[PDB]
């Protein structure tokens, strides 16, 4: 039950009690993901318009 | 002094962000017009509260915050609310139609077209900071914006601010206050793509806040205003160290140092007490031992789970009010001889304690009664895995039938991203089991 | 109209409880995966406790206490007793036991041999029994070498404990036996002891000069009905009920089952369950638990009661299924979900 | 500012569409001349959703009236609120459609469809942010069925990423005008399967039985049946026209109701339905028990014959929202054998403080139930009864159609039934 690193200031204090010792995707790569999904939306809408044109 | 920029995404993040900044102003003595009489340095200063507020030549204390929503109704409350004068228009960003609770729509379809605008507005706030620590990001799991656009913003912040820490306040989906059904999908999608980008996240389960509001506050059917005012108290308890003089959790990095020994396992459980109804005739003031003992009752946890059947990796005790170290240690001793507190063998069995003498501030007319002392415990338990298990099971039920998947594929998402995100959650669940179970 | 789910088709007990629940016309059984249930008759292994109590408006109840395995595992019970101050290492009603891991894997090998050498040198009876939870696999021997070598040949944790060389033998027959007590713990953590017990007797004469033939030493209902040639001679199915056993104690020993044995049993059930109450109580939990336990006791020739083990999913005696299953529905299920005596249980009062 | 464009086509579509604008105009305080006269700001909060604001604070519905003959729309223009509609928004011909899907879709209707789209484009071009479209029509005639489904096909081509919901009256031999109704209904259903995000299936027989059996109306009229549809339409759009719990747009509402793109046909319901014992206060238990009762549903399908994929309910009036949840969570947890268990929390409830005219409180039911397959089985059976003999086909082949197109519509509907059947097991 040890108290270590006791710090006191005007608005409070803090300390540590020990009870027992122990035993990314680049900017380019993101643009590709965003544009690849945008391209799948364009393709799906094209098949819809191609369907409606038929 | 180092600055923190808060980012509020989606309806949940914006309304929660609104409640916190209201609370911050009442705590730091700031008026709705941005004026702060106690700030003797006009138009400048490197005080502790300056980590969250900047100052104009006219003495206005302006939050270091950005509000983002794909639809404007929630952010229009801020533009016209009580604290409209605090923010300037550049800080409030709104689209014209939301993501319809569709992750793919917020991340890809709409997110792609507004991500650069948000980064620009954030860059402006960053350009006012002499030493930016990082970002606090508020959002929901369930919303199409809160889930889908946040994960895109997190990826870009990791690129544009490599050496900056990013903490989250995330709202876990609860059926009692949700008319949606696809929220398990969004939660898992956003956790997968946000995992590697978030240093420390505080999950708040709406189900937990709902019961605390009915149980302790005697609200029959709580509103978002009720939930948010309680949630902003816990948020204030967690961010107080950054805004006040002190020596514990004085910068965003210290949160990971003290609460996250393993990177992926960065979801500390939060417990708060006491929550006393204001309508009560007058409540007996609880002691340090009583409120500390309450921190091990599931009824006051931000995520309902049983820590008695987990292992602790870290534990932080944040006190506010009339509390002295003597009483803390005295209570902690008693609890160890009465409670089930099993730590992992590769972590010390101890508690870091912070005390701020200023008692919890309460919004006038709110539901919470003014107490003389309160505490918030941050403990990294494997028991919080129960929440990942619950959420992952709901995902499996719908995904077996591919229910609602066409809504995501229709916005440009590949079905493979579903199973890819799910297998990541399976790996996350296995990590908790290797750390907690024998 | 209450709803329940069945997730263990092998439980003879709760099969009868479910059969009774439906008979009331006020309980509806749902598919085993329907989460909108009031009562879960859960599985034995890996019961998903984390998914309980998260259905809006549904008060949910389960028939297993999360964490009670600490008390129903051979190796866990030994650890709980030695490390729990409420029971201490000097616990007088539990045989000396040691946790021994096979060498192919803390472990108490040296601690066991230290106590073993002490007995051998002191001329005292030095007979032990090695067993594990992964058994139908038990070995009784007086040599420490045989016990440890038997465990190494296996691959699971075992327990070596002292063998009661002075058991109380029933007459006529000169035969061993054990006592099974069923205990129900409701959501409020009241400890109810079923008024009906059973003595699983051995139909073979106890022989202390031959531990090789384990038919007279092991009183398991399956062993007697398989490796015993006098099964059912003295009592039907080698099952003597408290009425007869009590009558015997009066004629033979001039004492009652209550004074001589039951007081110690009630004391043991309390000490065990009160110990783990802080760890498994669902008092302030988002769901409610209750569980039926099966305690196994041994009695020596001094009429001292010894705890053998505790079962987490016990079966019942054929003649007592109806009365006990109905008793579970009365105090455990209907107490939480009421419907539109002279209790068969004995409430063991205690401080929570 | 999430605007909705309303289109009503054909006799049924315009007579039902008219009563709809009559109902909500009263709820928003709009008089027959377009001038507001309410006493609550909630009436104007979401007023732009369905109304345009003209000079002098006038509110003009955002509605387009379409027909191939002038008769019905002459009635509307001379009807109660006839003056409230934009004069330019009346688009009609003189030929008529002769209750022939081919005339509404391929010949007569094709000659008029472009001028309708010009009005639609005009209304859309003024919307700050278009939510989507809603169409009222019947499936048993020629205009609302044949030309309505043609309008949807051309609206989707020009607005591919906008929501399209319809209120579709399904024919029944009990309330029938012509024998070719099964033909027209089968041909429209496939258009709706492909091109609507939501279709509220309103069965004329269910409406009839409700008027005769529940309402005790000796001799029901089309007017009586339409009173039920107006009330149901006012119910489902309550969450769009007033502020409350949910503030979702058409797309978010569809996202949570439609787990599969083709299975988007809803069974609507309404409560109370009282016969003239009409002043008695209706309790929350009664509102809930009726709302889920089959007799209160307008699809003429027994839900106990299938399973709910998703269920929504809107409660209107000053009531105990706590006691609301108690009765809802009671109906679910007492009949969970009819809800699919692989969509967690598929029963959602919302409250609105404003009750309908002359009702302390009410509830509107919206079920995405696999039992709707019984409705398509009926239509298919009646279709094949005639088509096997090619009866009345000449009316359609004379308009350029071929028998093959009928065979395809037949297969499409029977596939639709097979899709509902797999999800019911
Ligand atoms: N605690 C709390 N939760 C909220 C609040 N608003 C919404 N939620 C929860 O957030 C989830 C819905 O996501 P939203 O945040 O509303 O959606 P969004 O982020 O705006 O994204 P969109 O789909 O585009 O609207 C549900 O689980 C709600 O219960 C709030 O103000 N406070
Ligand atoms: N220390 C000991 N001294 C004497 N006999 C013992 C003993 N340990 C076990 N036994 C004998 O073994 C039998 C029960 O063994 P044990 O209970 O350990 O195995 P088990 O758990 O598979 C049977 P059950 O679970 O049904 O009670 C009893 O009949 C008892 O006579
Ligand atoms: N509920 C209701 N159904 C109608 C009405 N008018 C016609 N119907 C039904 O709609 C079908 C006839 O279609 P109709 O609208 O007259 O054809 P259209 O004018 O060419 O579009 C038949 O099945 C009728 O039962 C009405 O006013 N109300
Ligand atoms: O599609 C629509 C609108 C076009 C009418 N709705 C279905 C979903 N409804 C709903 C009700 C309660 C609720 F809690 C959630 C959703 C409301 C209406
Ligand atoms: Ca200053
Ligand atoms: Ca990083
Ligand atoms: Ca012509
Ligand atoms: Mg939103
Ligand atoms: Mg056993
Ligand atoms: Mg007609």
Short mmCIF file of N, CA and C in Angstrom, two decimals, chain D residues 131-256:
data_model
loop_
_atom_site.label_atom_id
_atom_site.label_comp_id
_atom_site.label_asym_id
_atom_site.label_seq_id
_atom_site.Cartn_x
_atom_site.Cartn_y
_atom_site.Cartn_z
N UNK D 131 -36.47 15.02 -51.27
CA UNK D 131 -36.48 13.72 -50.62
C UNK D 131 -36.80 12.60 -51.60
N UNK D 132 -37.84 12.79 -52.40
CA UNK D 132 -38.30 11.76 -53.31
C UNK D 132 -39.75 12.00 -53.68
N UNK D 133 -40.33 10.98 -54.31
CA UNK D 133 -41.66 11.06 -54.88
C UNK D 133 -42.59 10.08 -54.18
N UNK D 134 -43.89 10.38 -54.23
CA UNK D 134 -44.91 9.45 -53.78
C UNK D 134 -46.05 9.47 -54.79
N UNK D 135 -46.52 8.28 -55.17
CA UNK D 135 -47.56 8.13 -56.18
C UNK D 135 -48.75 7.40 -55.58
N UNK D 136 -49.95 7.94 -55.80
CA UNK D 136 -51.19 7.28 -55.46
C UNK D 136 -51.86 6.79 -56.74
N UNK D 137 -52.31 5.54 -56.74
CA UNK D 137 -52.92 4.96 -57.93
C UNK D 137 -53.50 3.60 -57.56
N UNK D 138 -54.37 3.10 -58.43
CA UNK D 138 -54.81 1.72 -58.39
C UNK D 138 -54.05 0.92 -59.43
N UNK D 139 -54.05 -0.40 -59.24
CA UNK D 139 -53.38 -1.31 -60.16
C UNK D 139 -54.35 -2.03 -61.09
N UNK D 140 -55.66 -1.89 -60.88
CA UNK D 140 -56.67 -2.61 -61.63
C UNK D 140 -57.18 -1.94 -62.88
N UNK D 141 -56.92 -0.65 -63.05
CA UNK D 141 -57.36 0.09 -64.22
C UNK D 141 -56.27 0.25 -65.26
N UNK D 142 -56.37 1.33 -66.04
CA UNK D 142 -55.44 1.57 -67.12
C UNK D 142 -54.52 2.75 -66.90
N UNK D 143 -55.05 3.85 -66.36
CA UNK D 143 -54.24 5.05 -66.21
C UNK D 143 -53.31 4.96 -65.00
N UNK D 144 -53.87 4.89 -63.79
CA UNK D 144 -53.04 4.80 -62.61
C UNK D 144 -52.13 3.59 -62.63
N UNK D 145 -52.57 2.51 -63.27
CA UNK D 145 -51.78 1.28 -63.32
C UNK D 145 -50.76 1.34 -64.45
N UNK D 146 -51.24 1.44 -65.69
CA UNK D 146 -50.34 1.41 -66.84
C UNK D 146 -49.49 2.66 -66.96
N UNK D 147 -50.13 3.84 -66.87
CA UNK D 147 -49.36 5.07 -67.03
C UNK D 147 -48.65 5.46 -65.75
N UNK D 148 -49.21 5.11 -64.60
CA UNK D 148 -48.50 5.32 -63.35
C UNK D 148 -47.16 4.61 -63.33
N UNK D 149 -47.15 3.33 -63.73
CA UNK D 149 -45.90 2.59 -63.72
C UNK D 149 -44.96 3.07 -64.81
N UNK D 150 -45.51 3.65 -65.89
CA UNK D 150 -44.66 4.28 -66.90
C UNK D 150 -44.04 5.57 -66.37
N UNK D 151 -44.82 6.36 -65.63
CA UNK D 151 -44.27 7.56 -65.00
C UNK D 151 -43.14 7.21 -64.04
N UNK D 152 -43.30 6.14 -63.26
CA UNK D 152 -42.25 5.73 -62.33
C UNK D 152 -40.99 5.36 -63.09
N UNK D 153 -41.14 4.63 -64.20
CA UNK D 153 -39.98 4.23 -64.98
C UNK D 153 -39.23 5.44 -65.53
N UNK D 154 -39.96 6.49 -65.93
CA UNK D 154 -39.29 7.67 -66.47
C UNK D 154 -38.79 8.60 -65.38
N UNK D 155 -39.43 8.58 -64.20
CA UNK D 155 -38.92 9.36 -63.08
C UNK D 155 -37.62 8.76 -62.56
N UNK D 156 -37.56 7.43 -62.47
CA UNK D 156 -36.33 6.80 -62.02
C UNK D 156 -35.19 7.03 -63.01
N UNK D 157 -35.50 7.11 -64.30
CA UNK D 157 -34.46 7.36 -65.28
C UNK D 157 -33.87 8.76 -65.12
N UNK D 158 -34.70 9.74 -64.77
CA UNK D 158 -34.22 11.10 -64.60
C UNK D 158 -33.76 11.41 -63.19
N UNK D 159 -34.26 10.70 -62.18
CA UNK D 159 -33.86 10.90 -60.78
C UNK D 159 -33.46 9.56 -60.17
N UNK D 160 -32.42 8.92 -60.70
CA UNK D 160 -32.12 7.54 -60.29
C UNK D 160 -31.84 7.37 -58.81
N UNK D 161 -31.34 8.41 -58.13
CA UNK D 161 -30.96 8.30 -56.72
C UNK D 161 -31.93 9.03 -55.80
N UNK D 162 -33.20 9.09 -56.17
CA UNK D 162 -34.24 9.64 -55.32
C UNK D 162 -35.22 8.54 -54.94
N UNK D 163 -35.79 8.64 -53.74
CA UNK D 163 -36.68 7.60 -53.25
C UNK D 163 -38.02 7.67 -53.97
N UNK D 164 -38.61 6.51 -54.25
CA UNK D 164 -39.90 6.41 -54.92
C UNK D 164 -40.81 5.50 -54.10
N UNK D 165 -41.80 6.09 -53.43
CA UNK D 165 -42.81 5.37 -52.68
C UNK D 165 -44.17 5.52 -53.35
N UNK D 166 -44.99 4.47 -53.26
CA UNK D 166 -46.32 4.50 -53.84
C UNK D 166 -47.34 3.96 -52.85
N UNK D 167 -48.56 4.46 -52.96
CA UNK D 167 -49.73 3.89 -52.30
C UNK D 167 -50.58 3.26 -53.39
N UNK D 168 -50.59 1.93 -53.43
CA UNK D 168 -51.14 1.17 -54.55
C UNK D 168 -52.37 0.39 -54.10
N UNK D 169 -53.51 0.69 -54.71
CA UNK D 169 -54.75 -0.04 -54.45
C UNK D 169 -54.76 -1.30 -55.30
N UNK D 170 -54.82 -2.46 -54.65
CA UNK D 170 -54.83 -3.77 -55.29
C UNK D 170 -56.27 -4.20 -55.58
N UNK D 171 -56.52 -4.72 -56.78
CA UNK D 171 -57.89 -5.12 -57.13
C UNK D 171 -58.32 -6.36 -56.38
N UNK D 172 -59.64 -6.55 -56.33
CA UNK D 172 -60.26 -7.72 -55.73
C UNK D 172 -61.55 -7.99 -56.50
N UNK D 173 -61.85 -9.26 -56.80
CA UNK D 173 -63.12 -9.57 -57.48
C UNK D 173 -64.35 -9.15 -56.69
N UNK D 174 -64.22 -8.88 -55.39
CA UNK D 174 -65.38 -8.46 -54.61
C UNK D 174 -65.69 -6.98 -54.84
N UNK D 175 -64.66 -6.16 -55.04
CA UNK D 175 -64.85 -4.74 -55.30
C UNK D 175 -64.25 -4.42 -56.66
N UNK D 176 -64.89 -4.91 -57.72
CA UNK D 176 -64.30 -4.94 -59.05
C UNK D 176 -65.10 -4.09 -60.03
N UNK D 177 -64.40 -3.37 -60.90
CA UNK D 177 -65.01 -2.66 -62.01
C UNK D 177 -65.05 -3.51 -63.28
N UNK D 178 -63.93 -4.14 -63.62
CA UNK D 178 -63.83 -4.92 -64.85
C UNK D 178 -63.13 -6.24 -64.56
N UNK D 179 -63.32 -7.20 -65.47
CA UNK D 179 -62.71 -8.51 -65.31
C UNK D 179 -61.23 -8.53 -65.64
N UNK D 180 -60.69 -7.48 -66.26
CA UNK D 180 -59.29 -7.47 -66.68
C UNK D 180 -58.39 -6.94 -65.57
N UNK D 181 -58.96 -6.69 -64.39
CA UNK D 181 -58.16 -6.16 -63.29
C UNK D 181 -56.97 -7.06 -62.95
N UNK D 182 -57.11 -8.38 -62.87
CA UNK D 182 -55.91 -9.21 -62.63
C UNK D 182 -54.81 -9.01 -63.65
N UNK D 183 -55.16 -8.84 -64.93
CA UNK D 183 -54.14 -8.55 -65.94
C UNK D 183 -53.38 -7.27 -65.60
N UNK D 184 -54.12 -6.18 -65.36
CA UNK D 184 -53.48 -4.90 -65.10
C UNK D 184 -52.64 -4.94 -63.83
N UNK D 185 -53.13 -5.61 -62.79
CA UNK D 185 -52.40 -5.67 -61.53
C UNK D 185 -51.10 -6.45 -61.67
N UNK D 186 -51.15 -7.60 -62.35
CA UNK D 186 -49.94 -8.39 -62.54
C UNK D 186 -48.89 -7.61 -63.33
N UNK D 187 -49.33 -6.85 -64.34
CA UNK D 187 -48.38 -6.10 -65.16
C UNK D 187 -47.75 -4.96 -64.37
N UNK D 188 -48.52 -4.30 -63.50
CA UNK D 188 -47.97 -3.22 -62.69
C UNK D 188 -47.03 -3.75 -61.61
N UNK D 189 -47.39 -4.87 -60.98
CA UNK D 189 -46.61 -5.35 -59.84
C UNK D 189 -45.14 -5.51 -60.20
N UNK D 190 -44.86 -6.02 -61.40
CA UNK D 190 -43.46 -6.18 -61.79
C UNK D 190 -42.76 -4.84 -61.95
N UNK D 191 -43.48 -3.83 -62.46
CA UNK D 191 -42.90 -2.49 -62.53
C UNK D 191 -42.56 -1.97 -61.14
N UNK D 192 -43.41 -2.27 -60.15
CA UNK D 192 -43.18 -1.79 -58.79
C UNK D 192 -42.04 -2.56 -58.13
N UNK D 193 -41.96 -3.87 -58.37
CA UNK D 193 -40.87 -4.67 -57.82
C UNK D 193 -39.53 -4.06 -58.19
N UNK D 194 -39.41 -3.53 -59.41
CA UNK D 194 -38.15 -3.01 -59.91
C UNK D 194 -37.91 -1.55 -59.55
N UNK D 195 -38.96 -0.73 -59.47
CA UNK D 195 -38.78 0.72 -59.54
C UNK D 195 -39.33 1.50 -58.35
N UNK D 196 -39.86 0.86 -57.32
CA UNK D 196 -40.26 1.56 -56.11
C UNK D 196 -39.41 1.11 -54.94
N UNK D 197 -39.10 2.06 -54.05
CA UNK D 197 -38.44 1.73 -52.79
C UNK D 197 -39.43 1.24 -51.75
N UNK D 198 -40.66 1.75 -51.77
CA UNK D 198 -41.72 1.31 -50.88
C UNK D 198 -43.05 1.34 -51.62
N UNK D 199 -43.84 0.28 -51.45
CA UNK D 199 -45.21 0.24 -51.95
C UNK D 199 -46.12 -0.17 -50.80
N UNK D 200 -47.02 0.72 -50.40
CA UNK D 200 -48.04 0.40 -49.42
C UNK D 200 -49.19 -0.30 -50.14
N UNK D 201 -49.35 -1.59 -49.88
CA UNK D 201 -50.38 -2.38 -50.54
C UNK D 201 -51.71 -2.17 -49.84
N UNK D 202 -52.67 -1.58 -50.55
CA UNK D 202 -54.00 -1.32 -50.03
C UNK D 202 -54.97 -2.17 -50.83
N UNK D 203 -55.52 -3.20 -50.19
CA UNK D 203 -56.43 -4.13 -50.85
C UNK D 203 -57.86 -3.62 -50.71
N UNK D 204 -58.55 -3.47 -51.84
CA UNK D 204 -59.91 -2.96 -51.80
C UNK D 204 -60.85 -3.88 -51.04
N UNK D 205 -60.54 -5.18 -51.00
CA UNK D 205 -61.39 -6.10 -50.25
C UNK D 205 -61.23 -5.88 -48.75
N UNK D 206 -59.98 -5.74 -48.28
CA UNK D 206 -59.76 -5.45 -46.87
C UNK D 206 -60.46 -4.15 -46.47
N UNK D 207 -60.37 -3.12 -47.31
CA UNK D 207 -61.09 -1.88 -47.04
C UNK D 207 -62.59 -2.13 -46.99
N UNK D 208 -63.10 -2.98 -47.88
CA UNK D 208 -64.53 -3.27 -47.89
C UNK D 208 -64.95 -3.96 -46.59
N UNK D 209 -64.29 -5.07 -46.26
CA UNK D 209 -64.65 -5.81 -45.06
C UNK D 209 -64.58 -4.93 -43.81
N UNK D 210 -63.62 -4.00 -43.77
CA UNK D 210 -63.53 -3.10 -42.63
C UNK D 210 -64.74 -2.19 -42.56
N UNK D 211 -65.23 -1.72 -43.71
CA UNK D 211 -66.40 -0.85 -43.71
C UNK D 211 -67.66 -1.63 -43.37
N UNK D 212 -67.78 -2.86 -43.87
CA UNK D 212 -68.98 -3.65 -43.62
C UNK D 212 -68.94 -4.28 -42.23
N UNK D 213 -67.85 -4.98 -41.90
CA UNK D 213 -67.81 -5.77 -40.67
C UNK D 213 -67.49 -4.92 -39.45
N UNK D 214 -66.43 -4.11 -39.52
CA UNK D 214 -66.02 -3.36 -38.34
C UNK D 214 -66.81 -2.06 -38.21
N UNK D 215 -66.92 -1.30 -39.31
CA UNK D 215 -67.61 -0.02 -39.28
C UNK D 215 -69.12 -0.16 -39.38
N UNK D 216 -69.63 -1.34 -39.72
CA UNK D 216 -71.07 -1.60 -39.74
C UNK D 216 -71.78 -0.76 -40.80
N UNK D 217 -71.10 -0.54 -41.92
CA UNK D 217 -71.67 0.18 -43.06
C UNK D 217 -72.39 -0.83 -43.94
N UNK D 218 -73.72 -0.71 -44.01
CA UNK D 218 -74.51 -1.65 -44.81
C UNK D 218 -74.00 -1.72 -46.24
N UNK D 219 -73.96 -0.57 -46.92
CA UNK D 219 -73.60 -0.51 -48.34
C UNK D 219 -72.42 0.45 -48.51
N UNK D 220 -71.19 -0.06 -48.46
CA UNK D 220 -70.03 0.83 -48.60
C UNK D 220 -69.90 1.38 -50.02
N UNK D 221 -69.34 2.57 -50.11
CA UNK D 221 -69.05 3.23 -51.37
C UNK D 221 -67.54 3.40 -51.52
N UNK D 222 -67.12 3.80 -52.72
CA UNK D 222 -65.72 4.17 -52.90
C UNK D 222 -65.34 5.31 -51.97
N UNK D 223 -66.25 6.25 -51.75
CA UNK D 223 -66.00 7.31 -50.79
C UNK D 223 -65.63 6.77 -49.42
N UNK D 224 -66.40 5.79 -48.93
CA UNK D 224 -66.11 5.19 -47.63
C UNK D 224 -64.72 4.56 -47.62
N UNK D 225 -64.42 3.73 -48.62
CA UNK D 225 -63.11 3.10 -48.69
C UNK D 225 -61.99 4.14 -48.68
N UNK D 226 -62.21 5.28 -49.35
CA UNK D 226 -61.15 6.28 -49.45
C UNK D 226 -60.94 7.02 -48.14
N UNK D 227 -61.98 7.08 -47.29
CA UNK D 227 -61.80 7.66 -45.96
C UNK D 227 -60.77 6.88 -45.16
N UNK D 228 -60.73 5.56 -45.35
CA UNK D 228 -59.73 4.74 -44.67
C UNK D 228 -58.34 5.00 -45.23
N UNK D 229 -58.23 5.17 -46.55
CA UNK D 229 -56.92 5.39 -47.17
C UNK D 229 -56.36 6.76 -46.78
N UNK D 230 -57.20 7.79 -46.80
CA UNK D 230 -56.76 9.11 -46.36
C UNK D 230 -56.17 9.04 -44.95
N UNK D 231 -56.90 8.40 -44.03
CA UNK D 231 -56.43 8.30 -42.65
C UNK D 231 -55.13 7.52 -42.56
N UNK D 232 -55.00 6.45 -43.35
CA UNK D 232 -53.77 5.67 -43.33
C UNK D 232 -52.61 6.46 -43.92
N UNK D 233 -52.85 7.20 -45.01
CA UNK D 233 -51.80 8.02 -45.60
C UNK D 233 -51.38 9.13 -44.65
N UNK D 234 -52.34 9.77 -43.99
CA UNK D 234 -51.99 10.76 -42.97
C UNK D 234 -51.20 10.12 -41.83
N UNK D 235 -51.43 8.84 -41.57
CA UNK D 235 -50.71 8.17 -40.49
C UNK D 235 -49.25 7.93 -40.83
N UNK D 236 -48.99 7.35 -42.01
CA UNK D 236 -47.62 6.98 -42.36
C UNK D 236 -46.75 8.21 -42.58
N UNK D 237 -47.35 9.32 -43.02
CA UNK D 237 -46.59 10.54 -43.28
C UNK D 237 -46.49 11.45 -42.06
N UNK D 238 -47.07 11.05 -40.93
CA UNK D 238 -47.00 11.88 -39.73
C UNK D 238 -45.56 12.18 -39.33
N UNK D 239 -44.69 11.16 -39.37
CA UNK D 239 -43.30 11.37 -38.99
C UNK D 239 -42.58 12.30 -39.96
N UNK D 240 -43.13 12.51 -41.15
CA UNK D 240 -42.54 13.42 -42.13
C UNK D 240 -43.07 14.84 -42.00
N UNK D 241 -44.30 15.00 -41.52
CA UNK D 241 -44.98 16.29 -41.54
C UNK D 241 -44.93 17.01 -40.20
N UNK D 242 -44.46 16.37 -39.14
CA UNK D 242 -44.40 16.98 -37.82
C UNK D 242 -43.08 16.63 -37.16
N UNK D 243 -42.62 17.45 -36.22
CA UNK D 243 -41.42 17.10 -35.46
C UNK D 243 -41.74 16.10 -34.36
N UNK D 244 -40.76 15.27 -34.05
CA UNK D 244 -40.95 14.26 -33.02
C UNK D 244 -39.71 13.42 -32.82
N UNK D 245 -39.93 12.23 -32.27
CA UNK D 245 -38.85 11.29 -31.96
C UNK D 245 -37.93 11.12 -33.16
N UNK D 246 -38.44 10.53 -34.23
CA UNK D 246 -37.66 10.33 -35.45
C UNK D 246 -37.83 11.53 -36.38
N UNK D 247 -36.71 11.98 -36.93
CA UNK D 247 -36.68 13.05 -37.92
C UNK D 247 -36.10 12.53 -39.23
N UNK D 248 -36.44 11.30 -39.58
CA UNK D 248 -35.85 10.64 -40.73
C UNK D 248 -36.54 11.04 -42.02
N UNK D 249 -35.77 11.01 -43.11
CA UNK D 249 -36.29 11.23 -44.44
C UNK D 249 -36.67 9.89 -45.07
N UNK D 250 -37.22 9.94 -46.28
CA UNK D 250 -37.69 8.73 -46.94
C UNK D 250 -36.60 7.67 -47.03
N UNK D 251 -35.36 8.08 -47.31
CA UNK D 251 -34.29 7.11 -47.52
C UNK D 251 -33.92 6.39 -46.23
N UNK D 252 -33.78 7.13 -45.13
CA UNK D 252 -33.47 6.49 -43.85
C UNK D 252 -34.61 5.58 -43.41
N UNK D 253 -35.86 6.02 -43.60
CA UNK D 253 -37.00 5.16 -43.31
C UNK D 253 -36.97 3.88 -44.14
N UNK D 254 -36.66 4.00 -45.44
CA UNK D 254 -36.58 2.81 -46.27
C UNK D 254 -35.40 1.92 -45.86
N UNK D 255 -34.29 2.53 -45.43
CA UNK D 255 -33.11 1.74 -45.10
C UNK D 255 -33.41 0.75 -43.99
N UNK D 256 -34.26 1.14 -43.04
CA UNK D 256 -34.53 0.29 -41.88
C UNK D 256 -35.76 -0.58 -42.04
#
